[PDB]
Amino acid sequence: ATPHINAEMGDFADVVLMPGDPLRAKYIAETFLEDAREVNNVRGMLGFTGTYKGRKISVMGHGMGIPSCSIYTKELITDFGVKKIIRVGSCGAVLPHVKLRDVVIGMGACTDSKVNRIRFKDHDFAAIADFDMVRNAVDAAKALGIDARVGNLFSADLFYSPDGEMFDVMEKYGILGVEMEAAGIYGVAAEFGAKALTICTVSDHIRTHEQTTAAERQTTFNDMIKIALESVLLGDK
Amino acid sequence: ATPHINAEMGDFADVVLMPGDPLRAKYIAETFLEDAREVNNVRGMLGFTGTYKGRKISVMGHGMGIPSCSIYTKELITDFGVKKIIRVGSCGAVLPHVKLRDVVIGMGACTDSKVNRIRFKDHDFAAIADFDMVRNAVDAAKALGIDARVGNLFSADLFYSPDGEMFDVMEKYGILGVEMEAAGIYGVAAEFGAKALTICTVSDHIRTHEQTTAAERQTTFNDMIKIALESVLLGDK
Amino acid sequence: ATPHINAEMGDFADVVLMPGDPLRAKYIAETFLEDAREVNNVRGMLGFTGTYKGRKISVMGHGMGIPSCSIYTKELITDFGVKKIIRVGSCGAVLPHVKLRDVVIGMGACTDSKVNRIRFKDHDFAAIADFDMVRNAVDAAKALGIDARVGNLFSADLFYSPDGEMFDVMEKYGILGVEMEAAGIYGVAAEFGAKALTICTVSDHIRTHEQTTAAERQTTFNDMIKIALESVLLGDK
Amino acid sequence: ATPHINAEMGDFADVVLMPGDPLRAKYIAETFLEDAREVNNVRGMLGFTGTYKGRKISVMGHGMGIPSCSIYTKELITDFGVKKIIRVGSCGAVLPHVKLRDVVIGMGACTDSKVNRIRFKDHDFAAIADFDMVRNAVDAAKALGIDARVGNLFSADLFYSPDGEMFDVMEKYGILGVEMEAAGIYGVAAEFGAKALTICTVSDHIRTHEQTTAAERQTTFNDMIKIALESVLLGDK
Amino acid sequence: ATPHINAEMGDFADVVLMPGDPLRAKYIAETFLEDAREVNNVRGMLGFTGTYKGRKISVMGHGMGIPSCSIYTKELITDFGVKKIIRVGSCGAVLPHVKLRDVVIGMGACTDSKVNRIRFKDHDFAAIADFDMVRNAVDAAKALGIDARVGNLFSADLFYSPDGEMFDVMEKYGILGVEMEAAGIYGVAAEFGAKALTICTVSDHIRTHEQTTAAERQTTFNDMIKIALESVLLGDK
Amino acid sequence: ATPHINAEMGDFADVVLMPGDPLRAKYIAETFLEDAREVNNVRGMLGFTGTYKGRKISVMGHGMGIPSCSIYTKELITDFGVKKIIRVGSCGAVLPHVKLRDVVIGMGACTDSKVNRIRFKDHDFAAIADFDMVRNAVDAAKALGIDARVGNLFSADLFYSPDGEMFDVMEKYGILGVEMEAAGIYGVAAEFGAKALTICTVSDHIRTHEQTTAAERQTTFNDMIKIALESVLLGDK
Numbered sequence A, B, C, D, E, F: 001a002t003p004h005i006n007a008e009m010g011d012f013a014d015v016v017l018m019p020g021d022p023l024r025a026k027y028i029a030e031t032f033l034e035d036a037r038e039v040n041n042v043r044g045m046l047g048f049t050g051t052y053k054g055r056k057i058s059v060m061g062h063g064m065g066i067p068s069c070s071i072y073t074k075e076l077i078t079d080f081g082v083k084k085i086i087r088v089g090s091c092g093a094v095l096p097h098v099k100l101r102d103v104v105i106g107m108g109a110c111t112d113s114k115v116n117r118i119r120f121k122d123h124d125f126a127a128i129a130d131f132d133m134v135r136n137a138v139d140a141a142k143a144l145g146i147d148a149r150v151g152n153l154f155s156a157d158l159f160y161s162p163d164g165e166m167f168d169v170m171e172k173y174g175i176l177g178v179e180m181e182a183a184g185i186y187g188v189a190a191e192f193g194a195k196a197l198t199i200c201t202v203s204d205h206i207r208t209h210e211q212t213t214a215a216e217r218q219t220t221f222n223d224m225i226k227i228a229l230e231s232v233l234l235g236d237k
């Protein structure tokens, strides 16, 4: 057991899907995993392990922010033998042509956090995902007939930022989605020797202030999960 | 309701106690509040409202990290009329003369996060607590026969730091305890015109190592909460 | 015996009052101290030691700016056994409700200087005063029927700043007064393990030029010194 | 004609391969392009246009360093209709398992340059290549039976760096190759709206101080060019 | 008429000599100037104006540190029509070949202060002297049969720095002397369009403590003042 | 031979003139040197050696940008015995009173590059030229009846800057011309113990726009070279 996870080596699969919301992790287990059993509940951060088409798989929430997901991903990698981490969350769009419920794959992640500068002697560390995992997700999406843009995400420390002008800068440089974890998870993956990928579905528009509605939320969220789970199967082949 | 809190104005008291763990919020409401009702459960971040010696009081978790607690504290202050936030948590010690089960009060909070620089034109913003709240807590602690240390806390972004040299630095400049939120909460308090205070009990000595949990540890955690609750009453007069 | 102070261990009391203007040191010694004797003249920075109601106290100017006061406070602390430093000066206000002649106490001090970043591995060090000293000052003021605000000060490196926009920022974050030393003194105190406090009287409003009589100004200054001196006696009990 | 390129719209193909050495560009034209004609010689930065299997293609050197390649890539994109840029250069390895003449594909590029911070309001911009171009190069390499690692490169401003310790940091974070342009080219691509990719062949080892030798240089360099040219054909399909 | 100088336009010459120690201003006026008259006494920073071989010249101390001298130089330039400022002080050496009592002329000044970054949008501003003033000083020294080195000075914010390693760096880059004002004065001169120069005599070797007689020290000081004064006359021709 | 220069000790004079364009190096050798032989052609960066009025002199291009010229100048200094480097190039003007065809001498060079901060512990290193070389050039220019301006240059990393606001800044602080190398060369000179100087002719006014090239422009370029060559002879005596 680690400081934030009460479990033993073997309780988690070698691949773990992670939404920020622990309640969403429970939903994923009940909706997609077979023989799903709870493996963690410390601080209410629910974690589950089961199978998807005979493949052992785990799912656990990671909380909001780089500092929170950094704790959980690190402990999984160093004390539970987890080799691949797939964040499955929501994000805000800054580009006019990016629509609600769109699916985005972060090959890279920009950030205003200082964590990677602390790791990289104050220089620029390009926080990137594992290439094979990115390609697996693209193919899986293709097979499901679901569209998906591949590019840069922006991991923000402040959901309520006092610098609205920065959104113009994000847009100018082609940021596909604004979330709060990618850059940190990618930094941990590199520091502790594992592989990671972040997939998001546009839950709202930063400008239009339009947000998730109706039952489009479930279908779309379920599509993201399908892509993630299926992408792992391609990875195993 | 707000993006992360599904409740309405009036559901929260004008003073909120905030542990990092949602389950601790439930433990506090159950142990110290009378007629307590759950007022939020979004993302499992349980919030409650009840009364302490006739005084209307609320308690809700804030998750781990500056980005997390910044979201909740901001929503409380701007949408639920909250005027005071009192974080009640745990910290690691750096100073040798600081023993286990000591109660620490953060008059100020250092940090390796970039949020306050983003707010303050890249200069040094001294993240501090509200003076009257610090005095109220010091006075409540004395009335309970408990001696509290008042000084600087260090709010870290990485629980698992790559550095290590930074701890010699914290010790050299007198940091009393290391946690992950005070600096963020104090920044939010200043930005939106509210009042905040952070109180912590030493859970372990990053020096002599070994934490604390048992009868004596649990007794000290309860003293911290009584100090927080009693300080509110002093403030009311 | 020291590069900027020609005196020996024992010539200074363990408590020193420090105005910015050297001329004020002699005024304080003649007006408030008994049996005063000169203890320093190097570079014209006159120092005196005497007693106030029986308590041994010293007074000496520190010069304008962080670099200057950093030199004097360090030498006093490391070579003359000084335990407490109380800076007594003037400041400019940016908040509308802060009036001319108001007495301000800096529990913390923000700054655009780099000295603390150089000390704290380029992270954010919260430059704070000693809490007991702050409370002693507040109570001494109350006993003298004087109103005193406690909060953040801003220590500027440039009296004539090219960045006019920074004052709006200071106002937005509740800065009480603008001066040029606090954050530097607090940094030295933390570095060499001593205690410090900065008390200031509002000499001007950086937006609405006001007017004061020469007599009103001497009265306010004498009030600040009385607060400082009486606060020391409170700290002794 | 632009300040550094004497040519007119239409003289360059929509895709341009770029080695740092202009003499190498001439070699590529003579060895791989048909009906190759010189289109630029200003400052000796040779540029050529011809066909590869009926596909119109250009090749021009870009000089050494981010400031130099930034000039040329920008002018090609804004005044010559160039849509894809493929840098084909050499790099130094820092990882023990990365061998001489190995082929590396930079999906991302870290850097110690300040150019991207100047563009991204002093935050972290993840300098990444175009995903489709990366995948095209991987497939092309596969078809040719040539191996190729996909990952992060490090664009250095100083070939002769006074900070040797940084190489330990690069190695720790999995940097595949050390060159001097990738991060800048990726920044320009994003700023002016085009697509780019950097491919390198390990010409030496930073540690072992071993470098290119025998005729392995030509064969290996010719393999890189084959991958680049063929990857474009896949892109057109 | 100015916040730190109680005088009117015309009271100061268009050329001002400035020592750090206020006491030196009166010494220079009595020892080198004719028909001197006092023109300032605020805060004990005594100012004088007289003539040297017919030329009108003023002398006044500037206090220790960049913040202090920045205030005085700015006011003199913007409100008293001062065209040239010559700082005359002491410094510590880090280079072995730089001997005690050596006369050093700072053509440029490095610094660990943030004032120039605040002025120059966080980029590197090369704080330099006026070239003619530098050459005038060199020639005046030669005519007086005195040896003078011209190069870089380092303006420190902290006389007592916690970073001992920085002196090795200064030595490696050829720093001639360490003081605490040059870069600040040069910054002010550039900001308000005036000319400046800093001349210093080596008072100590920050590595090999030496010894000097009180008489040798007065001789060197008088030599520096003669160089400064004669350099002004050369500049007039 | 070195990594970028295929020559042997003795092939270069102890003084090298360096234009940015390789073709200009050929133009200079052909126009001003007698018995000139080509000594390098690696990457097309032509270098030559010959004599001027009996004095052994070399001239070689350095490419565009700090990273480029840093490579060549370092190799020359450490492997070919070069003791002086004189950059002879073009710059854009910012100050209105600075006209076309003016000869500018960079006593110092500001920059937006990070190379000197990397060398100088992240502090401000004042990149300056060698005093005697500046004086030699000023004296040679006078003997030729040419009036040269001596001051600060600004070495930019981006020829096509995203900012734009920075030019108002350069103008405000008196920058004489904008180029892309001086700061890098001065940093290399300090790091390896050599001497350097940069001379430029204004090719255009970033203000009034419109460059200069024709008889009068070419005459001024030749004057700069004569100034450089004649300054070497003065230095020899």
Ligand SMILES: Nc1ncnc2c1ncn2[C@@H]1O[C@H](CO)[C@@H](O)[C@@H]1O
Binding pocket: A020, A063, A064, A065, A089, A090, A091, A092, A156, A158, A159, A178, A179, A180, A181, A203, A204, A206, B003
């Ligand atoms: N505009 C926005 N800015 C930052 N994060 C945003 C967001 N919209 C959705 N998110 C996603 O949900 C969480 C917080 O609501 C975050 O963890 C996650 O990024």
Ligand SMILES: Nc1ncnc2c1ncn2[C@@H]1O[C@H](CO)[C@@H](O)[C@@H]1O
Binding pocket: A003, B020, B063, B064, B065, B089, B090, B091, B092, B156, B158, B159, B178, B179, B180, B181, B203, B206
């Ligand atoms: N050494 C340490 N570093 C960082 N956070 C520490 C800590 N010791 C306790 N904490 C406290 O508990 C949470 C994470 O365990 C954090 O929310 C909170 O700060």
Ligand SMILES: Nc1ncnc2c1ncn2[C@@H]1O[C@H](CO)[C@@H](O)[C@@H]1O
Binding pocket: C020, C064, C065, C089, C090, C091, C092, C093, C156, C159, C178, C179, C180, C181, C203, C204, C206
């Ligand atoms: N508006 C203002 N800005 C900065 N400093 C101010 C000030 N008003 C008074 N001061 C006080 O006097 C000194 C410098 O004038 C400083 O030491 C001290 O803060």
Ligand SMILES: Nc1ncnc2c1ncn2[C@@H]1O[C@H](CO)[C@@H](O)[C@@H]1O
Binding pocket: D020, D063, D064, D065, D089, D090, D091, D092, D156, D158, D159, D178, D179, D180, D181, D203, D204, D206, F003
């Ligand atoms: N160790 C090293 N550090 C930096 N750049 C290196 C290199 N080895 C090869 N290069 C490649 O060739 C050019 C300079 O020789 C550079 O343009 C390119 O990066």
Ligand SMILES: Nc1ncnc2c1ncn2[C@@H]1O[C@H](CO)[C@@H](O)[C@@H]1O
Binding pocket: E020, E064, E065, E089, E090, E091, E092, E093, E156, E159, E178, E179, E180, E181, E203, E204, E206
């Ligand atoms: N080693 C040293 N470091 C810093 N400043 C030094 C010094 N030796 C003399 N000084 C001179 O006296 C003042 C402060 O002592 C400074 O104004 C001035 O530079």
Ligand SMILES: Nc1ncnc2c1ncn2[C@@H]1O[C@H](CO)[C@@H](O)[C@@H]1O
Binding pocket: D003, F020, F063, F064, F065, F089, F090, F091, F092, F156, F158, F159, F178, F179, F180, F181, F203, F206
């Ligand atoms: N406005 C400007 N910005 C940057 N560099 C400038 C320039 N005007 C001329 N240059 C000079 O010519 C080269 C690039 O054209 C550069 O090497 C050299 O600096």
